[PDB]
Design a protein around this ligand. Structure first.
Ligand SMILES: Nc1ncnc2c1ncn2[C@@H]1O[C@H](COP(=O)(O)CP(=O)(O)O)[C@@H](O)[C@H]1O
Ligand SMILES: [Mg+2]
Length: 215
């Protein structure tokens, strides 16, 4: 039969929309730091499940290995960062990735306007949005122990969507899929990926694996 799926469309908080617009439409050198921000979010999420699981071991039933995978796909021009962290509930997606004001947003846009390096984004509580330095669209698939699997997605322009994900089940964690802009395909090259992890993500406390599809 025909599947029915529910979708919800949300407006970004005004300054978050403003920051997304600034990141998308301004030229920045040093855009490679997007990967650092996404790995450091996976790292934080893995911290979370590791500690929760000291309190209750059954939080690892959904999978015991705590790691980060990087999956560039030169065919569909996506770079996917997968972690087996804590994941996000539905409400976690809606609140943390776009509806709720971040206290640092305004200070970051002034910094940037004054000529700060886009690298500073990590200090302002808004590093997720560095994904739009390189991606025209971002899909986040996520599964938390307390909820079903969901898909968040935005091509920016002021809105994002959240829907139950009926794609491939993940046991627990988060998958960020960057649909890369046509001039940012260097981020699918295994040497560039390696270079930037070594530079910026060198002291992350969980194993990182790079998966390269056979040329
Ligand atoms: N891989 C992931 N796993 C779980 N939650 C994530 C995540 N990536 C982002 N988030 C959620 O998104 C929030 C915002 O991420 P940011 O990097 O924009 C700012 P910060 O919270 O890391 O200082 C995180 O605090 C987290 O709640
Ligand atoms: Mg972060």
């Amino acid at each position: 039969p025909m599947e029915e799926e529910e979708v919800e469309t949300f407006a970004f908080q005004a300054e978050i929309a403003q920051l997304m617009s600034l990141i998308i439409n301004t030229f920045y050198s040093n855009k490679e730091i997007f990967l650092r921000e996404l790995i450091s979010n996976s790292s934080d999420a893995l911290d979370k499940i590791r500690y929760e699981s000291l309190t209750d071991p059954s939080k690892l039933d959904s999978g015991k290995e705590l790691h980060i995978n990087l999956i560039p796909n030169k065919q569909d021009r996506t770079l996917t960062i997968v972690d087996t962290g804590i994941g996000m509930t539905k409400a976690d997606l809606i609140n943390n990735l776009g509806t709720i004001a971040k206290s640092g947003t305004k200070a970051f846009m002034e910094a940037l306007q004054a000529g700060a390096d886009i690298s500073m984004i990590g200090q302002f509580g808004v590093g997720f949005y560095s994904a739009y330095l390189v991606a025209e669209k971002v899909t986040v698939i996520t599964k938390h122990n307390d909820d079903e699997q969901y898909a968040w997605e935005s091509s920016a322009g002021g809105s994002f969507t959240v829907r139950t994900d009926t794609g491939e089940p993940m046991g627990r964690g988060t998958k960020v899929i960057l649909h890369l802009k046509e001039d940012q395909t260097e981020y699918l090259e295994e040497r560039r990926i390696k270079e930037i992890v070594k530079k910026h993500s060198q002291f992350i406390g969980y194993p990182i694996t790079l998966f390269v599809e056979k040329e």
